[PDB]
Design a protein around this ligand. Sequence first.
Ligand SMILES: O=P(O)(O)O[C@H]1[C@H](OP(=O)(O)O)[C@@H](OP(=O)(O)O)[C@H](OP(=O)(O)O)[C@@H](OP(=O)(O)O)[C@H]1OP(=O)(O)O
Ligand SMILES: Nc1ncnc2c1ncn2[C@@H]1O[C@H](COP(=O)(O)OP(=O)(O)OP(=O)(O)O)[C@@H](O)[C@H]1O
Lengths: 293, 1012
Amino acid sequence: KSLEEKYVAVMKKLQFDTFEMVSEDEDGKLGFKVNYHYMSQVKNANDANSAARARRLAQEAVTLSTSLPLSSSSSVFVRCDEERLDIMKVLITGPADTPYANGCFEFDVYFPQDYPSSPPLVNLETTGGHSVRFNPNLYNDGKVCLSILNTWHGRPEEKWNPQTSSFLQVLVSVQSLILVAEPYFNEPGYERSRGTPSGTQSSREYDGNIRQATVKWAMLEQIRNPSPCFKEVIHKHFYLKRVEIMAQCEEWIADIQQYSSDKRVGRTMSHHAAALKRHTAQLREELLKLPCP
Amino acid sequence: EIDDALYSRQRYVLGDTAMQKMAKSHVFLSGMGGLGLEIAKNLVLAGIKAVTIHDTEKCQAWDLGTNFFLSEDDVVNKRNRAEAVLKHIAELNPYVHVTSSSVPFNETTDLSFLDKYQCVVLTEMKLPLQKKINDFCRSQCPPIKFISADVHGIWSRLFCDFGDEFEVLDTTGEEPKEIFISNITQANPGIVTCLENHPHKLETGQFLTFREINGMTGLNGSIQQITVISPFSFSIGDTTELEPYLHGGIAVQVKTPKTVFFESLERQLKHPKCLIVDFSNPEAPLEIHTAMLALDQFQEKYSRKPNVGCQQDSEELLKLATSISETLEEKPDVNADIVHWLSWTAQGFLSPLAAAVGGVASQEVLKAVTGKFSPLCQWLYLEAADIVESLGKPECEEFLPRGDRYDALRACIGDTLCQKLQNLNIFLVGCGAIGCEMLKNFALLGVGTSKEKGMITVTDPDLIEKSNLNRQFLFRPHHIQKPKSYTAADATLKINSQIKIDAHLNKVCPTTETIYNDEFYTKQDVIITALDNVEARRYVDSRCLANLRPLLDSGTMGTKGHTEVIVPHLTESYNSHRDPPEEEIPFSTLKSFPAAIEHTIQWARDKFESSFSHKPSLFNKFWQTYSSAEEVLQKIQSGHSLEGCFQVIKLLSRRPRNWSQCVELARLKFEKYFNHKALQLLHCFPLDIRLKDGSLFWQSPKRPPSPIKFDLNEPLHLSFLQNAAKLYATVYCIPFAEEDLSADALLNILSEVKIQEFKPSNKVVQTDETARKPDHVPISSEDERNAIFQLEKAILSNEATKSDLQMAVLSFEKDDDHNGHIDFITAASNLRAKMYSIEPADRFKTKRIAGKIIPAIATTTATVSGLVALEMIKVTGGYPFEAYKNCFLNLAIPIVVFTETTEVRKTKIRNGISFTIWDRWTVHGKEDFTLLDFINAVKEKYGIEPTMVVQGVKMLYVPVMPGHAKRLKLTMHKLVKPTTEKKYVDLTVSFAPDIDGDEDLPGPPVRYYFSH
Ligand SMILES: O=P(O)(O)O[C@H]1[C@H](OP(=O)(O)O)[C@@H](OP(=O)(O)O)[C@H](OP(=O)(O)O)[C@@H](OP(=O)(O)O)[C@H]1OP(=O)(O)O
Ligand SMILES: Nc1ncnc2c1ncn2[C@@H]1O[C@H](COP(=O)(O)OP(=O)(O)OP(=O)(O)O)[C@@H](O)[C@H]1O
């Protein structure tokens, strides 16, 4: 797989890097260069930083720079401010064989003043104006519900642990739990409807809606509105991977055509299929328009 | 009736019965020195029914250093001291009937009149007539409680005698313990195993009672004496004849009075029962006893105190002590140094030592009239010894009188040290009773009175309250709702006009660090704290550690207290203390399975705050986020996932419009809380449901509750409904009147109210003891459409105005009665107690627990303040490490323990290099100085190469971060981009650990001066 070889070779150099995200004025107040979520929290953060916080971040930095998962199924890309580590931004592509597949999702992360005593704040940025609850644990505004973040129910081993938990663990958990091929039954109660024909039918409905929303935002709006933090990286990734998506869109269109005949959920699959085919045509246009950086 | 609004904190210490006896007590005091003055102060603050003071002396200028009510006018008029200051003492408490007397006391003085009193305290008194008075006291029927104390220089004496037999009604104020029984056997003696994870925490010979025990129904209500087998098992005596054991059971501690025996004062002159406060000197108290007896004999022989530095007097006192030691039962070695120091400081007076001994003596007096705690038996000696030996051998002229009010202190510590105290700059945080006592000590000591240098600063953000008047003696009722610091400082100058003091209304916190910058801390010499929380302590500790200044702290709770001393380059920081965090009640236990009344009170408090603070905040924040309910309706119609909108709509659909509907909603809430929840939980868990092993689910500690049937005629129900209706009317801004609260009107309102029938549900129960409050279960579309219909109907009914989008948010007031928060919480807690068949609780313990009220008393604060003044004197002396003594105490036992402060540790960073918490490294450079030059300079001066650099919250350099080799070439000013405010900058640097993969070891903070 020459495509796989080049994919691994190129983005290896791009999975980690620093990038100044906050320009600084004369009086010590922060002027944010690009979009970010914790405007007021960062600006109001106390300047009495705990030394253990910085030391833990520095110790993490080695692993976070050397051991980022890299594969054509999914990869992680890591950027932080060139003068502050607690401001954080991460980009992830969707694992293959999922409704999320190859979709680019940007995150905002901030490490609290008491870190590592508490998990860092995590947030979705590819919300499309908070249009869609893309994952049952992932609210439309972007708020993240993970037991490791203490933002989801779970046993103590599933909770945040200042002594053992690592940011890389959260990164991996994103792919392993949120970015799955099976999001619908993750909603509490639907895991009981797993296997039931009605539950699986509603799962097909939800996953088709998620597929069309991903095609809209995570691919079409991402390429049409590239983010500065990964502008060259995303275009190179899309140039490399595009051969897959031009068939992924067609297979999804073929799947939703089978659903559309259904009288309960296929009626909504008709609207989602119209949206899907429109965005697929537009995405093919953009792929033809896509240059190689 | 007890004035609870003034005495709540004292009630939480003593108990109502002790004060009820206290309201029938007459206490007499003789001698009116500073010690007697403070005794009167503490007793009048405690609120004795009647106090009689006595004095045969007249005012002198020398008394101005020991009294904080006297004025120059009183000395000029040559008035009797007690009768002069009597008017001032009456200000402290109007309830106390304070009287005075001046009848001369001598060998022919009749003592029969003293029978009207229950306890008599003697100060400034000749020992033989003390013997006679003690003989009279214990010969009475019942005997009059006898207490005597003395203060002489840096030495003090305290003695107690309650006759041949005295009854202690309660040994200690600790709450009796209750323990679930896991196992118990029919044996001779029977063996009891408590809950396997819960420690027994009891001792052999104690008495226990038993309740709710299954198997042996006969053990219910029985009392046995126990014998500990293990920290989880014990024996209670024969139980073989009993019926077989089944399960459950609770053992409740039983308190028993104990008789304590006191010898006569004369008979205690030999073999005195002396309390020990320093285990390293288990003989010093006896030596001090011998020395005090020698001093008394010298005063008897020569009718005068020894002169300072008088070799003849010192030798005579040595001979007297040697002779007395020979007559003693044990004959201890006479301490020549102690005798020398006593002779040196015989004529002097030390007020902080007086403060400590007066506090402990007042606590003993309180014990004498209540029997609430085990008293001293029979002797206790306190010293300020460490001060004098640190000065070597000074001259007598250092202590000779000079005519001012400070002559008494000068004879004790010397003029130079007094001048040092006068020059000090002091920062004091917190204006509590501890702070007030410390300020009084400063004023009497001449602290900061130097017209040039000395300067005091205090600050506190709160105003004065009536409850504060019980222990903050500086204040008066006409000072309520006025700044504590301002009033305290204003009153201080009346004690001493020479003091120079400044005050602020500021809360010490990171935001106020601008006012209290590093330069301000450098201007200060000593920082003292009277805080009530740990976070502020840690903040002040960190600031003082950064500024390299000594810090003093003291904690006070009930009769327990402690003193913390922190000295630069000598001691650990307060942050070095790492006491275990409090473990809170399990979430499942709190919500679903309470067993303690504290669980129910916590549940009631949390429900109160959720209903009246949290949810109101959510509602108003929702209406601030979204302009109109129509907007939210449109958005949810388009599937917008707004937050809290469902709860806001549910509140609006439940919104009352008149008082009757508020009462209806309160009744519905009552039904929900105390009937429906029981039926739900019993539907999930039947009374006879069983576990994997077949044991009943409803077994200890899991109490199966029983649903409650409403009855307005029940006073508890009436109070609950009234308070809930009032709070809800405040919530919805519905006006009302007191007549609406009348029971008949409420019955009329509820007469037409239909009680909704219960229906079960299948909600999963978080039975996990390690569980926590999770996020909500996702909401069904049924609730979505129901709420949609609700706000659609509301809009159609015009219930969408801004007023409909408005409702009050209530703070948790805990002191006033009219707000009804305390009554509401008490009613809910008692309903929940009856709910789970747990015993109810009274209003005042509910107020204590819910408000987190720390019990307080004047005796403890005075005792700790005297000590604190002592170690700050030691700090002013610049004394070696050995002199500084931390202290812990618990007057309940009573017990006092001194211990040297914890030695500062050295952090071995690498290669034999070590540094302390007080260490801050320095580097000097220039504008062309670079980061590589910085690394070289560190590797040269301290022999270790930096591995990582941090600019505060910003990172400065990390080797693994991209392109940071170039930063080594950049100059300090270019890369820091500093302001012109400083000639330096502070950074954080760590170093590579000995084992790779480990975190870099943190070093001390480093300061790079921009110049040399
Ligand atoms: O949210 P909390 O104040 O912590 O308490 C809630 C609340 O009861 P209140 O309405 O009396 O405050 C719920 O009601 P809503 O907030 O939704 O109005 C109620 O749920 P239901 O209305 O569905 O009965 C729930 O009870 P439960 O957890 O048993 O479902 C109950 O919990 P607690 O009173 O035990 O805290
Ligand atoms: N950060 C702070 N800065 C200044 N003063 C503080 C700070 N934190 C607490 N205090 C003060 O500490 C004092 C502690 O004294 P005290 O024991 O009387 O407490 P309280 O809260 O007033 O009393 P109570 O518990 O009886 O209501 C308070 O008066 C409070 O104003």
